Design an enzyme around this catalytic site. Structure first.
Site, PDB file in Angstrom:
ATOM      1  N   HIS B 118       0.811  -1.230   0.000  1.00 56.37           N
ATOM      2  CA  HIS B 118       0.000   0.000   0.000  1.00 56.37           C
ATOM      3  C   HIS B 118       0.845   1.281   0.000  1.00 56.37           C
ATOM      4  CE1 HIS B 118      -2.890  -3.083   1.442  1.00 56.37           C
ATOM      5  NE2 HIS B 118      -3.685  -2.436   0.610  1.00 56.37           N
ATOM      6  N   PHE B 330      -8.410 -16.871  -4.394  1.00 60.27           N
ATOM      7  CA  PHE B 330      -8.669 -15.457  -4.531  1.00 60.27           C
ATOM      8  C   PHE B 330      -9.325 -15.187  -5.894  1.00 60.27           C
ATOM      9  CE2 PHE B 330      -6.441 -11.178  -5.372  1.00 60.27           C
ATOM     10  CZ  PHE B 330      -7.497 -10.462  -4.847  1.00 60.27           C
TER      11      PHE B 330
HETATM   12  O1  LIG Z   1      -7.107 -16.042  -0.745  1.00 61.55           O
HETATM   13  N1  LIG Z   1      -7.200 -14.647  -0.739  1.00 61.55           N
HETATM   14  O2  LIG Z   1      -8.285 -14.072  -0.689  1.00 61.55           O
HETATM   15  C1  LIG Z   1      -6.021 -13.916  -0.801  1.00 61.55           C
HETATM   16  C2  LIG Z   1      -4.838 -14.440  -0.312  1.00 61.55           C
HETATM   17  C3  LIG Z   1      -3.682 -13.680  -0.386  1.00 61.55           C
HETATM   18  C4  LIG Z   1      -3.717 -12.410  -0.946  1.00 61.55           C
HETATM   19  C5  LIG Z   1      -4.911 -11.912  -1.425  1.00 61.55           C
HETATM   20  C6  LIG Z   1      -4.998 -10.597  -2.048  1.00 61.55           C
HETATM   21  C7  LIG Z   1      -5.934  -9.657  -1.633  1.00 61.55           C
HETATM   22  C8  LIG Z   1      -6.002  -8.418  -2.270  1.00 61.55           C
HETATM   23  C9  LIG Z   1      -7.023  -7.397  -1.829  1.00 61.55           C
HETATM   24  C10 LIG Z   1      -6.740  -6.859  -0.456  1.00 61.55           C
HETATM   25  C11 LIG Z   1      -5.730  -5.918  -0.268  1.00 61.55           C
HETATM   26  C12 LIG Z   1      -5.491  -5.443   1.017  1.00 61.55           C
HETATM   27  N2  LIG Z   1      -6.225  -5.866   2.056  1.00 61.55           N
HETATM   28  C13 LIG Z   1      -7.223  -6.743   1.890  1.00 61.55           C
HETATM   29  C14 LIG Z   1      -7.508  -7.267   0.630  1.00 61.55           C
HETATM   30  C15 LIG Z   1      -5.151  -8.093  -3.341  1.00 61.55           C
HETATM   31  C16 LIG Z   1      -4.194  -8.982  -3.810  1.00 61.55           C
HETATM   32  C17 LIG Z   1      -3.340  -8.671  -4.845  1.00 61.55           C
HETATM   33  C18 LIG Z   1      -2.417  -9.624  -5.266  1.00 61.55           C
HETATM   34  C19 LIG Z   1      -2.353 -10.876  -4.648  1.00 61.55           C
HETATM   35  N3  LIG Z   1      -3.170 -11.208  -3.631  1.00 61.55           N
HETATM   36  C20 LIG Z   1      -4.085 -10.311  -3.178  1.00 61.55           C
HETATM   37  C21 LIG Z   1      -6.055 -12.660  -1.367  1.00 61.55           C
HETATM   38 MG   LIG Z   2      -7.516   0.223   0.436  1.00 57.96          MG
HETATM   39 ZN   LIG Z   3      -5.921  -0.040  -2.897  1.00 59.00          ZN
END
Ligand SMILES: O=[N+]([O-])c1cccc(-c2cc(Cc3ccncc3)cc3cccnc23)c1
Ligand SMILES: [Mg+2]
Ligand SMILES: [Zn+2]
Ligand SMILES: O=[N+]([O-])c1cccc(-c2cc(Cc3ccncc3)cc3cccnc23)c1
Ligand SMILES: [Mg+2]
Ligand SMILES: [Zn+2]
Lengths: 371, 370
Positions: B118, B330
């Site tokens: 971020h 995801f």
């Molecule tokens: O299995 N998963 O859902 C899972 C497992 C590991 C990573 C993620 C993930 C969430 C978010 C969105 C996000 C960003 C910040 N905070 C919360 C959500 C963005 C991502 C971007 C690239 C790779 N993984 C992501 C999802």
């Molecule tokens: Mg945000």
């Molecule tokens: Zn964002």
């Protein structure tokens, strides 16, 4: 030697005048380099096959330590150290239980910080594995006793434990408690040693419990000498001593080096771990590029902490004024290459592919210099 | 809709019973997704290299890492000045280069460089993607410039001053920020406050020349859009987008009909939300880099939780991740459904975006171990 000293500062004045790039690299150099699975591997994993493939590189300079981290649930240090100790039969020789060993290695890994981009367990694991390969260089393989092999590899493991991700000079400039505790001289390196040995006292962690008193004393001195030698500001003096050693070296029989006294032996070991510590640009380009991006991340964050504090930004720590490509070329030309060239001379015919990869890498970063 | 809520609950229950891995992905989802200077705006001596990367400004493939590389780590300032030159927004709203660069530098400087995901790189990425998405043929004639400005600015500021920890960590640690905003959309409210507060700095008021009515509409739209990036609002945005798709109107030139403010803002907020979740739809070199960054940020949060003796939130334990399986989950349960619905709204547009997602997904599956 006033000649070497006169020659050093000449070499750096010239660089400092070539361009503003050279001035920033030259300022950096002066302020830096001058004075079944838990028993199969050390670690729990359901990727036993991918991990077993990576660990076939245990004795190769090309082992990918990043993939080891991936398949070891991010315990590259515990994993690699377990592998090296199994490989060299060190647990049996020193009557160390796997239990004591893993408990210590997990506690040590835990005291490396994962929020520090470079000086974390990954770097420790790389330096320990690279030391493991270096100790098998043919000119030395017959030379060192197991106590010395153990000291070196342990030295490597602990050499940066509890590193905060800022330099000795920032710690002195911000009046850190650590700088205060250690009186501005080798701040981090003294700390790494204190932590590494203090952790043996934790429950089930005395991996040297079964050595004799004379063994423990010899290990401790050897290890202290090696880790204090990773203080970057000692680089020129270490290289000076290595060069004089090259010009007066004795080969015994079958290519092996003759190292009679303790002084000769510790000099080589401490240059060895120092070389391991500076081995990043000698690895394959995939590996090297990851390491560069990590160290620059870490330098840049120190730079921000300086900026927050209203201090002057140290050389190579300004994210808005670095030239990463030119800097890498300088770092190879002026520090990594001279060091590795001298090492190749000491241990010839070894280190020559290492030296050729170093030139490829250097030339790749040159090819990527805009204008 | 109760049948959407029941269906949603059903699939997540099936997912957590699949295996340890699906349990953790399912715990994650429930806790997350439910309720030179003249030329580029930055001083660089890589004017040629930067210019070449910036020829991808209008493309999904733009490599923002290289832009950071050639812009002396000012990817946001640089991208934003490119977009604003591109669309002629500075002239149209009578924003001077001085005011604009000063604000953009100040904004970039308030993103934390010690936060792995971020930071201004992600903001710049989301800004550039919003810019590409706004040129989708089905929408491209639909929006006024004030709406375009709001959406792009929204994207620029959407995570400013992010500390690298989750809304739930901030609530659990009794953060001052959670106290200030009363546990609801903690970060997103904060991002908005900072972004708008920074207009008040010296030479930073980029909306100085808009009429009052223009400032009022822009601020409402921006607030709407940034609060919408709260992940916990994911499922209800998708539900709306799906009922939008089923009741959609088209003029004939292939262009969507959006009369009232509600349908307009509903698209704009799904658009920036989709930009925020675009990492896995990008080329594999890029997405790998983003995954590694977001995983680092989760892991650090996990360590802060362990340093505190709290239980480690899902996906934040470095010793029990399965990054590959987690990415596949995801995509299947969150990224693909959203983009498939988006592709329907704007068809034929998002069709290669969507094929890249399949490729990326399958590559991550091909890397699942054992
Ligand atoms: O299995 N998963 O859902 C899972 C497992 C590991 C990573 C993620 C993930 C969430 C978010 C969105 C996000 C960003 C910040 N905070 C919360 C959500 C963005 C991502 C971007 C690239 C790779 N993984 C992501 C999802
Ligand atoms: Mg945000
Ligand atoms: Zn964002
Ligand atoms: O211009 N340069 O010489 C220069 C510019 C940028 C990076 C470096 C650099 C220093 C050190 C050794 C080190 C580690 C921690 N603190 C101080 C030195 C290790 C490195 C490893 C990979 C890439 N760069 C490195 C050198
Ligand atoms: Mg060190
Ligand atoms: Zn080191």
């Amino acid at each position: 030697s006033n000649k070497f000293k006169r020659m050093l500062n000449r070499e750096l004045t010239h660089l400092s005048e070539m361009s503003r790039s050279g001035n920033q690299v030259s300022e950096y150099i002066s302020n830096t380099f001058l004075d079944t699975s838990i028993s199969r591997f050390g670690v729990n994993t359901e990727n036993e096959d991918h991990l077993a493939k990576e660990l076939e590189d245990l004795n190769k300079w090309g082992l990918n330590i990043f993939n080891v981290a991936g398949y070891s649930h991010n315990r590259p240090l515990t994993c690699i150290m377990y592998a090296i100790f199994q490989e060299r039969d060190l647990l049996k020789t020193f009557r160390i239980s796997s239990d004591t060993f893993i408990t210590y290695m997990m506690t040590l890994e835990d005291h490396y910080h994962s929020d520090v981009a470079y000086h974390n367990s990954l770097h420790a694991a790389d330096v320990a594995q690279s030391t493991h390969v270096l100790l098998s260089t043919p000119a030395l393989d017959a030379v060192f006793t197991d106590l010395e092999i153990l000291a070196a590899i342990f030295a490597a493991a602990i050499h940066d434990v509890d590193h905060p991700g800022v330099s000795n000079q920032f710690l002195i400039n911000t009046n850190s408690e650590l700088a205060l505790m250690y009186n501005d001289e080798s701040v981090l390196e003294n700390h790494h040693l204190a932590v590494g040995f203090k952790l043996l006292q934790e429950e089930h962690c005395d991996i040297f419990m079964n050595l004799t008193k004379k063994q423990r004393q010899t290990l401790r001195k050897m290890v202290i000498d090696m880790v204090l030698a990773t203080d970057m500001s000692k680089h020129m003096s270490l290289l000076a001593d290595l060069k004089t050693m090259v010009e007066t070296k004795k080969v015994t029989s079958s290519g092996v080096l003759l190292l009679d006294n303790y002084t000769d032996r510790i000099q080589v070991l401490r240059n060895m771990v120092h070389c391991a510590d500076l081995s990043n640009p000698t690895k394959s380009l995939e590996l090297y590029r990851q390491w560069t991006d990590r160290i620059m991340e870490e330098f840049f964050q120190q730079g921000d902490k300086e900026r927050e504090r209203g201090m002057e930004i140290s050389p190579m720590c300004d994210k808005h004024t670095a030239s990463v490509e030119k800097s890498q070329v300088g770092f190879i030309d002026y520090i990594v290459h001279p060091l590795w060239e001298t090492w190749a001379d000491l241990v010839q015919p070894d280190a020559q592919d290492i030296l050729d990869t170093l030139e490829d890498n250097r030339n790749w970063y040159q090819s990527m210099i805009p204008q």
